[PDB]
Amino acid sequence: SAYDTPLGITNPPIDELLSRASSKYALVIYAAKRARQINDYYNEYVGPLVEPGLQEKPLSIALREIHGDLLEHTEG
Amino acid sequence: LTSIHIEEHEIDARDTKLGAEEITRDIPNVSDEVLADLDERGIVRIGAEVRDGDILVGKVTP
Amino acid sequence: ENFDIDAEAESLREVIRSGKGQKKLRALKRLKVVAAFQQSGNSPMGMVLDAVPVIPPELRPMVQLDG
Amino acid sequence: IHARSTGPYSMITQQPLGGKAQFGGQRFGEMECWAMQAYGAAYTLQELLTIKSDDTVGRVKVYEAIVKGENIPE
C-alpha cells in the first residue's frame, strides 16, 4: 500500500485519517473546530501541537495533527 | 486572429424635481488623476485608454 | 364568540356514529377542521381581522429610476 | 470571465446583483444545493445560502473577519 508521497491538500492521506475519527463527517468537524481553535490561538487557546510550517494554514495543521494522534474527540 | 471589439456606453442628463442633471468635468469628490483623461465638456478625450473602473462621462445629480 | 368547540367536536363524533353511509363522510369532512381547533393553543377568534397587518415597505418598494 | 470577493449589493433583493457588467457574483442554484447536500457539506451550503448571499450582518462581518484573519462568524 505505497503512494510514494502526497502533495498539497491530499497530504495527509484520507484513509489514514478515516481510521482516527468515527467517519469523514466527524473528521470534518474534528479538523474544523481544531482549525478554528488554531485560528483563535494567533488572536480556547491550545496549539499548535505539531511543529507548523513557516507560512502554513490551520486546516493543514489540524489535518496533520489528527493523523499524528495528538487529539481526542467526543461524539454528542 | 486579433479582433477589434467596439462597445457603446450611453448616459442622459434627465430632468428631476429637485434641480437638473448636467454632463460637466468638475466633480466634488474625485482626484485630478481620474479627470486628467476628461476634457472641458466633461467626457474622456478620443483615444485615451480606459481601465475597468475609470470615469468616462462626468455627470452630477442635484 | 357564541361558540363551544368541545360540544361541537363531541356531537360530530356521535353524528358520524349515528348515520353511517354518505352523511357520515360529510360529518367526518366537517370533523377534522373542528377537532383541530381544540388542541390548537390559538383560538378560532383570530380567523376574522379587526386590524390587518402591513408588510415592510422595502418588500413593496417605490424607487425612482435613472430619469 | 467573472470574479467577486465583495462589492455592491442590490437594494430590493439582499443577494449580490447578477451580471458580468455590474461586477456581479454567480447563481448557486437548487441543483447545486442538491449536490452539496448529497455530499453533506452542511457548513458550506449554510455559508453559501447565508453570509455568502442573503445575510446583511454576515456579508459585512465575513469580509472584516477574513481581512482581520479571525474565525468566520456562525
UniProtKB/Swiss-Prot annotation, chain A:
It comes from the Bacteria. It catalyses: RNA(n) + a ribonucleoside 5'-triphosphate = RNA(n+1) + diphosphate. GO terms for cellular component: DNA-directed RNA polymerase complex. The chain holds residues 24 to 106 of 107 of the full protein. Disulfide bonds: none annotated. The RNAP catalytic core consists of 2 alpha, 1 beta, 1 beta' and 1 omega subunit. When a sigma factor is associated with the core the holoenzyme is formed, which can initiate transcription. Belongs to the RNA polymerase subunit omega family. Its EC number is 2.7.7.6. Promotes RNA polymerase assembly. Latches the N- and C-terminal regions of the beta' subunit thereby facilitating its interaction with the beta and alpha subunits. This is DNA-directed RNA polymerase subunit omega. One of its GO terms (biological process) is DNA-templated transcription. It is an enzyme of class 2 (transferase). Coiled coil: none annotated. GO terms for molecular function: DNA binding; DNA-directed RNA polymerase activity. Keywords: DNA-directed RNA polymerase, Nucleotidyltransferase, Transcription, Transferase.
From Swiss-Prot, chain B:
DNA-dependent RNA polymerase catalyzes the transcription of DNA into RNA using the four ribonucleoside triphosphates as substrates. This subunit often mutates to generate rifampicin (Rif) resistance. Interaction with RbpA partially restores Rif-inhibited transcription; once the subunit is Rif-resistant however RbpA no longer stimulates transcription. Belongs to the RNA polymerase beta chain family. The RNAP catalytic core consists of 2 alpha, 1 beta, 1 beta' and 1 omega subunit. When a sigma factor is associated with the core the holoenzyme is formed, which can initiate transcription. Interacts with RbpA, which partially restores Rif-inhibited transcription. Mutations in the RRDR sequence (residues 423-449) confer rifampicin (Rif) resistance. Rif blocks transcription initiation but not elongation. This is DNA-directed RNA polymerase subunit beta. The gene is rpoB.
Swiss-Prot record, chain C:
Signal peptide: none annotated. It comes from the Bacteria. Belongs to the RNA polymerase beta' chain family. The RNAP catalytic core consists of 2 alpha, 1 beta, 1 beta' and 1 omega subunit. When a sigma factor is associated with the core the holoenzyme is formed, which can initiate transcription. DNA-dependent RNA polymerase catalyzes the transcription of DNA into RNA using the four ribonucleoside triphosphates as substrates. This is DNA-directed RNA polymerase subunit beta'. It comes from Mycolicibacterium smegmatis (strain ATCC 700084 / mc(2)155). The gene is rpoC. The chain holds residues 266 to 332 of 1317 of the full protein.
